[PDB]
Design a protein around this motif. Structure first.
Motif, short mmCIF file in Angstrom:
data_model
loop_
_atom_site.label_atom_id
_atom_site.label_comp_id
_atom_site.label_asym_id
_atom_site.label_seq_id
_atom_site.Cartn_x
_atom_site.Cartn_y
_atom_site.Cartn_z
N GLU A 34 30.35 5.03 24.60
CA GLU A 34 29.76 4.87 25.93
C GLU A 34 28.53 3.97 25.87
OE1 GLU A 34 29.01 8.92 27.03
OE2 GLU A 34 31.09 9.20 27.67
N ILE A 35 27.67 4.20 24.88
CA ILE A 35 26.46 3.39 24.71
C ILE A 35 26.82 1.92 24.46
CG2 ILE A 35 24.37 3.01 23.35
CD1 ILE A 35 24.37 6.01 22.70
N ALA A 36 27.83 1.68 23.62
CA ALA A 36 28.26 0.32 23.33
C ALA A 36 28.75 -0.35 24.60
CB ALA A 36 29.37 0.32 22.28
N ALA A 37 29.56 0.38 25.37
CA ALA A 37 30.13 -0.13 26.60
C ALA A 37 29.10 -0.48 27.66
CB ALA A 37 31.14 0.86 27.16
N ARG A 38 28.09 0.36 27.84
CA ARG A 38 27.07 0.07 28.84
C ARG A 38 26.27 -1.18 28.48
NH1 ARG A 38 24.32 4.59 30.72
NH2 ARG A 38 22.43 3.41 31.28
N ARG A 39 26.22 -1.50 27.19
CA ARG A 39 25.50 -2.67 26.72
C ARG A 39 26.40 -3.89 26.56
NH1 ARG A 39 20.61 -0.67 22.81
NH2 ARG A 39 20.18 1.27 23.97
N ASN A 40 27.67 -3.73 26.90
CA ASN A 40 28.66 -4.80 26.79
C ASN A 40 28.73 -5.34 25.36
OD1 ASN A 40 30.34 -6.79 28.75
ND2 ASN A 40 29.18 -5.28 29.94
N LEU A 41 28.69 -4.42 24.40
CA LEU A 41 28.75 -4.73 22.99
C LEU A 41 29.86 -3.89 22.35
CD1 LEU A 41 26.62 -6.78 22.80
CD2 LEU A 41 24.99 -4.98 22.27
N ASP A 42 30.08 -4.08 21.05
CA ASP A 42 31.11 -3.34 20.33
C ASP A 42 30.47 -2.30 19.42
OD1 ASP A 42 33.51 -5.07 21.03
OD2 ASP A 42 32.29 -6.56 20.01
N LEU A 43 31.24 -1.27 19.09
CA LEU A 43 30.80 -0.21 18.18
C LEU A 43 31.49 -0.61 16.87
CD1 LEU A 43 29.34 2.52 18.00
CD2 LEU A 43 31.55 3.61 18.32
N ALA A 50 29.72 6.33 4.41
CA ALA A 50 28.42 6.99 4.48
C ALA A 50 28.64 8.35 5.13
CB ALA A 50 27.45 6.16 5.30
N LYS A 51 27.67 9.25 4.99
CA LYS A 51 27.78 10.59 5.55
C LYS A 51 26.64 10.94 6.50
CE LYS A 51 30.20 12.65 1.57
NZ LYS A 51 29.92 11.54 0.62
N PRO A 52 26.90 10.94 7.82
CA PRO A 52 28.20 10.63 8.44
C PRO A 52 28.37 9.10 8.48
CG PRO A 52 26.62 11.09 10.12
CD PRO A 52 25.96 11.47 8.83
N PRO A 53 29.58 8.60 8.78
CA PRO A 53 29.82 7.15 8.84
C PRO A 53 28.83 6.45 9.76
CG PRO A 53 31.88 8.32 8.81
CD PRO A 53 30.82 9.35 9.09
N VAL A 54 28.34 5.28 9.32
CA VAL A 54 27.37 4.52 10.11
C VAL A 54 28.00 3.44 10.97
CG1 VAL A 54 25.24 3.17 10.06
CG2 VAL A 54 25.61 4.96 8.35
N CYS A 55 27.62 3.44 12.24
CA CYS A 55 28.10 2.46 13.20
C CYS A 55 26.92 1.66 13.74
CB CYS A 55 28.81 3.14 14.38
SG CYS A 55 30.46 3.75 14.00
N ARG A 56 27.15 0.38 13.97
CA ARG A 56 26.12 -0.50 14.50
C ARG A 56 26.63 -1.09 15.80
NH1 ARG A 56 22.32 -2.43 11.74
NH2 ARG A 56 23.44 -2.25 9.74
N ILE A 57 25.76 -1.17 16.79
CA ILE A 57 26.13 -1.75 18.08
C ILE A 57 25.83 -3.24 17.96
CG2 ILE A 57 25.65 -1.83 20.56
CD1 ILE A 57 25.09 1.08 20.53
N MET A 58 26.85 -4.07 18.17
CA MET A 58 26.69 -5.51 18.06
C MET A 58 27.89 -6.22 18.66
SD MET A 58 27.88 -6.50 14.15
CE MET A 58 27.64 -5.05 13.21
#
Length: 76
Positions: A34-43, A50-58
């Motif tokens: 949802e956060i990625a979408a509101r910013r018109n970016l990708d997750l 990693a624990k938990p897996p790491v995602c970057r918005i870009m």
RNA sequence: CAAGCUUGAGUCUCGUAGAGGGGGGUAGAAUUCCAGGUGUAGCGGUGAAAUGCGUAGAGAUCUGGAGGAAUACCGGUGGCG
């Protein structure tokens, strides 16, 4: 190089880092999307193991284009 | 050699068909490019692929504009030289 993004991600929860380096904390995949979408970016899953897996918005396309550009230029 | 003759060959009049030639205008389709709206993870290509292009948002769609090149249908053992 290649990262899985958006709906390809299977992790229930991920640690989220936004486009500017802000550590958003542990979020459900749904909220992260949802956060990625509101910013018109990708997750993007940048650290699958990693624990938990790491995602970057870009912007994945812009990121990938620049990476390929870099590789090509340095070899010609 | 000289005079002729009108059928060969020309000239005259009025019309006809034609991508015949040269110059100048102009048109709508499409490609590519530029600028934007919508949209989002693929597009493209092949026997299969990969190189290539796309999250600096491509391709797809709609809009406006630039430019060059060629003129679908008509079109046809059709036409002109």
């Amino acid at each position: 190089k290649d990262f899985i993004i958006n709906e390809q991600i299977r992790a229930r929860e991920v640690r989220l880092i936004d486009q500017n380096g802000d550590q958003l904390g542990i979020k459900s995949k749904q909220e992260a999307l949802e956060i990625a979408a509101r910013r018109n970016l990708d997750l993007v899953l940048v650290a699958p193991n990693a624990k938990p897996p790491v995602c970057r918005i870009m912007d994945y396309g812009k990121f990938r284009f620049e990476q390929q550009k870099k590789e090509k230029e340095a070899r010609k």
